[PDB]
Design a protein around this ligand. Structure first.
Ligand SMILES: C[C@@H]1COCCN1c1cc(C2(S(C)(=O)=O)CC2)nc(-c2cccc3[nH]ccc23)n1
Length: 247
C-alpha cells in the first residue's frame, strides 16, 4: 500500500526533525493554559506530535500536505515569538531538514504520490492546473490593491477576523489547492474564488472598497475563464475520463 510506505517516510522525517537541537518546544502542542493568549494570536496550531498522529491517520497523501502543516510550526512561531526569535530559527531548522530529506527522496516520493492519486500524473490535470494558476497570478492577483486577499488573514493583525469569518479563503490557499491538483473543473475552483468575495461582503460590508476589489477579482476570473472556455471544457472532459478510468 503506497500510503503506508509514504507514511513511513514522513514519520522518519519527523524523527529526524525531533532530534535537531533545541526543538523540544515544538514536540507537543502549546499549553494554552500556560500561554493564555496563544489562541487569541494563532489560528492553526501545529506541533510534531500532532503532525505524527496525522501521518498515522493517513491524512497526507503527498509531500505537499505534510509540508504545509509542518510550515505552520514556523509561521506560528514567527507570529507569536517573532521572526528572528531563537524559537523561530529552531523551527526553521526543522523545515530546512525536511526539505533536504524530501529533495533526496523526490523520485521515490513522486512514484508513491502518483500511485496514491494517478491524476497527479495526468497531463490534462496538469495542464488544467497550470492554466488556473496563471489566472490567479497574472489576472486575479494583478487587480489593483488586491493585497488583502492574497494570503490568509493573520489574526495578530486583525484580531476578530475569524470570529466573523469561519470559512476563510484567499488566493494563496487557492494556489496551494491548484498545486495539489484539488480542482478537476471550474465549478470547485469558482466555489473557492466566490468564498473570497462572500467573506469580504460579510466582514467589510457590501459597499466597502475591499468588497469592490474582491468583486473585481471575481469578475476578472470569470472574464478569463470565458476567454479560455473551449480549451478548459476539453481539459475537463479528459480529466473526467481519466478519473473514471482510475477505477
Ligand atoms: C480585513 C481586511 C479586509 O478584508 C480582507 C482581508 N483584510 C486584510 C488582510 C490582511 C492580510 S495579513 C497582513 O493579515 O496577512 C492577508 C493580507 N491584512 C489586513 C490588515 C492588516 C493590518 C492592518 C490593516 N488595516 C486594514 C487592513 C489591514 N487586512
Amino acid at each position: 500500500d503506497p500510503m503506508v510506505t509514504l507514511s513511513s517516510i514522513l514519520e522518519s522525517i519527523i524523527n529526524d526533525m525531533r532530534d535537531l537541537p533545541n526543538t523540544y518546544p515544538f514536540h507537543t502542542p502549546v499549553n494554552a493554559k500556560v500561554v493564555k493568549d496563544y489562541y487569541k494570536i494563532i489560528t492553526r496550531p501545529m506541533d510534531l506530535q500532532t503532525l505524527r498522529e496525522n501521518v498515522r491517520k493517513r491524512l497526507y497523501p503527498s509531500r505537499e500536505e505534510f509540508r504545509e502543516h509542518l510550515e505552520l510550526i514556523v509561521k506560528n512561531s514567527a507570529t507569536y515569538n517573532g521572526p528572528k526569535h531563537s524559537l523561530t530559527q529552531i523551527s526553521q531548522s526543522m523545515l530546512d531538514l525536511c526539505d533536504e530529506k524530501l529533495k533526496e527522496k523526490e523520485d521515490k516520493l513522486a512514484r508513491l504520490e502518483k500511485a496514491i492519486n494517478p491524476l497527479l500524473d495526468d497531463d490534462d490535470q496538469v495542464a488544467f492546473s497550470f492554466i488556473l494558476d496563471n489566472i490567479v497570478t497574472q489576472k486575479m492577483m494583478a487587480v489593483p490593491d488586491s493585497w488583502p486577499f492574497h494570503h490568509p488573514v493573520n489574526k495578530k493583525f486583525v484580531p476578530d477576523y475569524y470570529k466573523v469569518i469561519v470559512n476563510p479563503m484567499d488566493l494563496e490557499t487557492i494556489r496551494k489547492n491548484i498545486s495539489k491538483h484539488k480542482y478537476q473543473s471550474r465549478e470547485s475552483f469558482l466555489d473557492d474564488v466566490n468564498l473570497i468575495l462572500a467573506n469580504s461582503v460579510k466582514y467589510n460590508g457590501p459597499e466597502s472598497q475591499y468588497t469592490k476589489t474582491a468583486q473585481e477579482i471575481v469578475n476578472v476570473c470569470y472574464q478569463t475563464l470565458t476567454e479560455y472556455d473551449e480549451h478548459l471544457t476539453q481539459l475537463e472532459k479528459d480529466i473526467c475520463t481519466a478519473k473514471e478510468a482510475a477505477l
